[PDB]
Amino acid sequence: GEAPNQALLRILKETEFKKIKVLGSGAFGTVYKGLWIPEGEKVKIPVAIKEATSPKANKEILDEAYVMASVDNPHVCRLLGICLTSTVQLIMQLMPFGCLLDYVREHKDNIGSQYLLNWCVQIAKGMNYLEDRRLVHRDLAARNVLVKTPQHVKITDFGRAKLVPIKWMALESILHRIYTHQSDVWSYGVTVWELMTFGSKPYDGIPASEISSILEKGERLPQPPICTIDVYMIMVKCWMIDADSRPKFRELIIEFSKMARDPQRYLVIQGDERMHLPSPTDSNFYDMDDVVDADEYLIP
């Protein structure tokens, strides 16, 4: 029926890696900056470690590990391994610039049309991969897209991924709890809106209980000032009542790619092209000796 999931679950030793500092915290626990130096490989891999102990919380963190180890794409956050301490630790690739939501907010005056459209292509690619792997994300947002380098973003948070965030949810999802890859398209449309507005909160001030009826009436998120009808039309198509009428991720890759070839024709930003963002060809962009990124460190 279904193909056997031959993914390898890597078990890392507590002594094999160290916690440098705290990146962010919440209700789940906390995410630490860290370094992983495996066995005797003469490599230092920059990592992010996701840390009360209870049997049900450990099932939830192990389910997230299962899903995360069962993915491999340049625009998806893969699980490097797990550490079997009192409470299970998830070891993932360090995405130094953090989430895209906080990134667009903090760097607005330096974010141009090329970056914005390149991000859209990259998220669509990552999402289309999840669709190929028959994986419904169920929590796509600009807060769940991480920045490796300003020119490379990846999809994260598989704590909801299967084979509530109302303001990102499709109408069928709010009303009937139906989650399809076309419901992820709605969440993608909201994500694009989050980027195009440089981090605005969707339906700000409106309570989540009012959203259901608002979408039912025919109301949608407004057109960002930088958005041409071409880009907004896409966002709107992601928000159709008929899930089948919404675009497919493979089409979103195509659409945003054509636009990324001539970004100034599709996004009107004041002082565009003269805008600068960190590049791997910059001064002190990165002990430092023997540091390899996880994307270049393959197999045990």
Ligand SMILES: COc1ccccc1Nc1cc[nH]c(=O)c1C(=O)Nc1ccc(N2CCN(C)CC2)cc1
């Ligand atoms: C799976 O856990 C997550 C779910 C949703 C969003 C983020 C994460 N955490 C992950 C998961 C994997 N890799 C990472 O690097 C992270 C992560 O959060 N990294 C991360 C987060 C924040 C930062 N700073 C960016 C600059 N800012 C001013 C201060 C914080 C740096 C790295």
